[PDB]
Amino acid sequence: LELDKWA
Amino acid sequence: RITLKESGPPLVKPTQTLTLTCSFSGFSLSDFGVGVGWIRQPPGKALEWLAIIYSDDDKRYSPSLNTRLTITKDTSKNQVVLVMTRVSPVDTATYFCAHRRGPTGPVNAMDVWGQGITVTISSTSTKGPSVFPLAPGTAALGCLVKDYFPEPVTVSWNSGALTSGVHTFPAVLQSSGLYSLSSVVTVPSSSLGTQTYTCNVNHKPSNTKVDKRVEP
Amino acid sequence: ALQLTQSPSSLSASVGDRITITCRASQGVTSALAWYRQKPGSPPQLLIYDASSLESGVPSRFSGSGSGTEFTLTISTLRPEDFATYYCQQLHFYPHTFGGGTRVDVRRTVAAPSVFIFPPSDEQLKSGTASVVCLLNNFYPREAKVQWKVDNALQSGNSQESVTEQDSKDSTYSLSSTLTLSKADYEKHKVYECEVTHQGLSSPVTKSFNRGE
Numbered sequence: 001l002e003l004d005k006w007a
Numbered sequence: 008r009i010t011l012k013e014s015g016p017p018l019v020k021p022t023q024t025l026t027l028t029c030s031f032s033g034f035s036l037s038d039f040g041v042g043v044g045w046i047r048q049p050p051g052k053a054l055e056w057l058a059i060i061y062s063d064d065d066k067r068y069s070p071s072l073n074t075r076l077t078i079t080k081d082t083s084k085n086q087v088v089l090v091m092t093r094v095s096p097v098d099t100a101t102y103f104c105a106h107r108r109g110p111t112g113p114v115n116a117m118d119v120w121g122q123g124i125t126v127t128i129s130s131t132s133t134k135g136p137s138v139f140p141l142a143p144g145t146a147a148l149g150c151l152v153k154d155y156f157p158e159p160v161t162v163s164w165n166s167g168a169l170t171s172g173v174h175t176f177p178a179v180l181q182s183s184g185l186y187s188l189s190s191v192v193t194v195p196s197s198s199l200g201t202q203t204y205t206c207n208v209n210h211k212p213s214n215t216k217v218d219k220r221v222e223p
Numbered sequence: 224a225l226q227l228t229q230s231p232s233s234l235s236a237s238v239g240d241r242i243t244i245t246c247r248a249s250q251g252v253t254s255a256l257a258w259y260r261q262k263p264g265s266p267p268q269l270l271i272y273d274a275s276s277l278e279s280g281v282p283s284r285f286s287g288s289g290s291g292t293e294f295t296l297t298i299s300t301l302r303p304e305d306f307a308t309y310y311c312q313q314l315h316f317y318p319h320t321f322g323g324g325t326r327v328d329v330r331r332t333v334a335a336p337s338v339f340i341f342p343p344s345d346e347q348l349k350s351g352t353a354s355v356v357c358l359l360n361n362f363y364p365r366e367a368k369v370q371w372k373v374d375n376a377l378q379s380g381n382s383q384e385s386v387t388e389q390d391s392k393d394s395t396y397s398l399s400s401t402l403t404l405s406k407a408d409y410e411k412h413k414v415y416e417c418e419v420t421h422q423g424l425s426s427p428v429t430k431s432f433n434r435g436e
Binding site for chain 3: 044046053054055056059067068069070103107112113115116117118119120121122123137139140141142145147149151153174176177178179181187188189191193
């Protein structure tokens with residue numbers, strides 16, 4: 001998957 | 008500082024739709040980054056992430072609840088709405104809304120949470136309890152307060168004159184959608200033929216109160 | 224999908240003890256992991272944010288460390304207000320993920336439960352159903368196992384139980400289980416037994432009543 005904004 | 012809070016119907020029927028609302032105040036959804044998510048916790052189990060909505064409107068849902076959840080924000084009121092459709096008894100839990108940060112690096116954690124509003128699913132009308140005896144040196148007797156709804160009922164023994172040895176377990180929501188809980192008190196034999204034991208049951212939600220004594 | 228399964232999952236410690244609980248992640252989550260302490264009755268409270276940062280207002284006794292896949296949250300000195308459930312959450316991947324929870328209860332000497340079995344009541348028995356209950360009174364630790372048997376057929380999927388919260392005084396727990404048969408089924412079996420397994424008993428103890436003798 002999928003990252004978050006602040007990564 | 009920041010305080011959010013949860014509103015909605017505490018009692019919901021299988022199939023319909025649960026609309027919960029988070030009212031916060033200490034921030035606005037106009038502040039950059041600021042997010043507000045929904046976390047839910049089944050009775051006695053762990054926290055489960057539901058969805059999050061940010062200042063500028065993206066929204067990520069839970070892959071497993073994606074086709075059932077819808078998150079929105081009305082910036083004039085400072086509420087966040089979460090709609091979860093076709094609910095079932097398994098959606099019975101406590102629902103929390105929380106405030107997440109914004110870059111000033113520590114936008115890394117849900118720092119403030121609403122207090123929680125527990126929702127319970129059950130296509131079931133109010134209904135008084137049936138109180139049955141649970142009876143027989145240490146010895147146990149008690150009362151089984153069966154099929155009532157919704158919570159809560161209250162239980163004391165001997166009109167309060169006996170508070171030690173007691174135990175008033177957490178009710179369980181049965182498959183029938185009704186509740187059932189037991190209240191046991193541990194006395195020491197001897198008194199068993201000389202002492203008297205009566206549980207006073209009161210289920211305010213239906214006006215049914217029951218004094219029901221107990222013995223061998 | 225981002226598993227993350229928090230280690231030590233039910234501590235058992237006293238006040239003044241020093242415990243270290245862990246949270247493993249199946250995929251690296253930078254340092255986007257947070258720690259919370261929840262104490263029965265209410266909402267989760269932030270202690271550590273960004274894996275190692277102490278949240279403003281939180282006691283200095285809480286600390287956090289780790290990066291990528293391993294994270295820990297240590298309590299230099301255990302306080303009364305620390306006996307609760309702790310959770311870790313990563314916010315590096317969507318969906319944001321919580322661990323299963325680790326709980327630390329007050330430690331006391333192992334106490335085997337006092338088992339009692341209560342047959343259905345004659346009055347309930349004519350409304351069409353039979354509820355037989357088993358009481359495991361005041362025991363420690365919390366883990367206990369109850370198995371119902373009717374004429375020796377292990378019963379599965381027709382009993383329910385709930386456990387009280389640790390007694391603030393003797394620190395024991397008490398459990399309640401309810402076997403619910405349909406009246407007719409109750410009246411066509413003999414031995415109703417409740418067998419309890421617990422750290423405090425060498426071999427399981429059973430309690431039975433034979434319906435009508």
